[PDB]
């Protein structure tokens, strides 16, 4: 390449990272971030424990 | 025991055995071998 700092934007070096995902018939181990809130008591409310 | 792609074992030292681990490993196990 021969990257020089005085080159134009079209010739500047660009770091590219590509993420790939694969799914199979095996138990998956990668998932996405979750939520989780607070904890109230003595009230008729809906809950979701895991 | 291995079933549905999970490998879990039980252990107890000095009654029922407590559970101890579990792997989500999905290999096919057919033979058994020990070493000393």
UniProtKB/Swiss-Prot annotation, chain A:
Span of the entire protein shown here: 495 to 544 of 1273
Segments for region (Disordered): 25-47
Official protein name in the record: Spike protein S1
Subunit text: Binds to host ACE2. RBD also interacts with the N-linked glycan on 'Asn-90' of ACE2. Cleavage of S generates a polybasic C-terminal sequence on S1 that binds to host Neuropilin-1 (NRP1) and Neuropilin-2 (NRP2) receptors. Interacts with host integrin alpha-5/beta-1 (ITGA5:ITGB1) and with ACE2 in complex with integrin alpha-5/beta-1 (ITGA5:ITGB1). May interact via cytoplasmic c-terminus with M protein. May interact (via N-terminus) with host bilirubin and biliverdin, thereby preventing antibody binding to the SARS-CoV-2 spike NTD via an allosteric mechanism.
Organism, scientific name: Severe acute respiratory syndrome coronavirus 2 (2019-nCoV)
Function: Attaches the virion to the cell membrane by interacting with host receptor, initiating the infection. The major receptor is host ACE2. When S2/S2' has been cleaved, binding to the receptor triggers direct fusion at the cell membrane. When S2/S2' has not been cleaved, binding to the receptor results in internalization of the virus by endocytosis using host TFRC and GRM2 and leading to fusion of the virion membrane with the host endosomal membrane. Alternatively, may use NRP1/NRP2 and integrin as entry receptors.
Gene designation per UniProt: S
UniProtKB/Swiss-Prot annotation, chain B:
Superkingdom of origin organism: Viruses
Residues annotated as glycosylated: 28
Effect of residue 16 to V: In strain: 20A.EU1
Task performed by this protein: Attaches the virion to the cell membrane by interacting with host receptor, initiating the infection. The major receptor is host ACE2. When S2/S2' has been cleaved, binding to the receptor triggers direct fusion at the cell membrane. When S2/S2' has not been cleaved, binding to the receptor results in internalization of the virus by endocytosis using host TFRC and GRM2 and leading to fusion of the virion membrane with the host endosomal membrane. Alternatively, may use NRP1/NRP2 and integrin as entry receptors.
Subunit organization: Binds to host ACE2. RBD also interacts with the N-linked glycan on 'Asn-90' of ACE2. Cleavage of S generates a polybasic C-terminal sequence on S1 that binds to host Neuropilin-1 (NRP1) and Neuropilin-2 (NRP2) receptors. Interacts with host integrin alpha-5/beta-1 (ITGA5:ITGB1) and with ACE2 in complex with integrin alpha-5/beta-1 (ITGA5:ITGB1). May interact via cytoplasmic c-terminus with M protein. May interact (via N-terminus) with host bilirubin and biliverdin, thereby preventing antibody binding to the SARS-CoV-2 spike NTD via an allosteric mechanism.
Protein name in the entry: Spike protein S1
Organism: Severe acute respiratory syndrome coronavirus 2 (2019-nCoV)
Chain's gene name: S
Residues of the full protein shown: 195 to 242 of 1273
